[PDB]
Amino acid sequence: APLTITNRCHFTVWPAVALVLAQGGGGTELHPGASWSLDTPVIGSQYIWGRTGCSFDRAGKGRCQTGDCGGSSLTCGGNPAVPTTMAEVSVLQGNYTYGVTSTLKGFNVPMNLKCSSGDALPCRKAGCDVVQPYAKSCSAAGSRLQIVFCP
Ligand code: NA
Numbered sequence: 001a002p003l004t005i006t007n008r009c010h011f012t013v014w015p016a017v018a019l020v021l022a023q024g025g026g027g028t029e030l031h032p033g034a035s036w037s038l039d040t041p042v043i044g045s046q047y048i049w050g051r052t053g054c055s056f057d058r059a060g061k062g063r064c065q066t067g068d069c070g071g072s073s074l075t076c077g078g079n080p081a082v083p084t085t086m087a088e089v090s091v092l093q094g095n096y097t098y099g100v101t102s103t104l105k106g107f108n109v110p111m112n113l114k115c116s117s118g119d120a121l122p123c124r125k126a127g128c129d130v131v132q133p134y135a136k137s138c139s140a141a142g143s144r145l146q147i148v149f150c151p
Contacts, residue, residue, distance in 0.1 A: 001144055003038035003089070005048065007031070009150035013109060014051035016069055018078055019044055020088075025074040029054075030149075040145070045090035047078050050109040050149050066108040082106045085123060087113055087147055088135070096145055099135030102128045112151035116144040124151065 005015045007030035015036055018025025025047075028036050053065025056072055067084035069076045083106025088099045098113040100123045107126035114120045115138030122128065138145065 001037060002040045003145045003147075004035050005030070005038065005147045005149075006035040007033065007050075007149045009109065011052060012054075013149050014054045014064060014067075015147075015149075016047075016049055016051055016067070016074055016080070018047050018069070018074060018076070020047060020078060023075050023077045025069070025077070027051075027074060040089075040091050040096075042093045043091060045088060048087040048089060048147055049080060049084050050111075051080070051084075052109065080105070083108045083126075085109050085111050087111055087123075089113075089145065094139075094141065096138040096143065097135050098138065098145065099133050100129065101132065101134065102126045109149050110151065112146075112148040114146045114148070116140070116146075118143075122151070 016027040051064040051067035056062035117140035118138030
């Protein structure tokens with residue numbers, strides 16, 4: 001509420017959110033079963049992807065096994081390492097559109113993008129998007145976006 005990223009894999013994933021035109025981004029560590037509640041901007045679009053096999057020290061430098069974006073400092077920008085599953089979310093004041101690919105940058109983690117007002121958009125193996133825009137629209141006053149890993 002309003003954006004939620006959930007990890008349904010049996011392994012830890014490291015979600016990363018970066019806006020399309022910005023040098024860097026943010027994220028968290030998600031243990032199996034854990035979710036990340038996020039607040040959404042009035043405007044703009046964001047890339048959302050998961051990273052696996054991240055090992056960091058107390059500072060901490062380190063790299064992720066898949067979907068690594070400049071290590072700890074999530075600067076790329078918007079270009080994590082192949083392979084990685086790429087989810088895109090655009091926002092208008094209130095309205096959401098959500099799209100995903102597993103062809104452009106490969107496939108690492110299966111995804112499911114869904115809205116409480118919209119229809120489900122699955123991406124469970126590589127090649128889920130036949131052609132872009134592989135996206136659905138969501139349009140409510142109090143709607144709720146969900147990204148699931150390993151749905
Ligand atoms: Na990080």
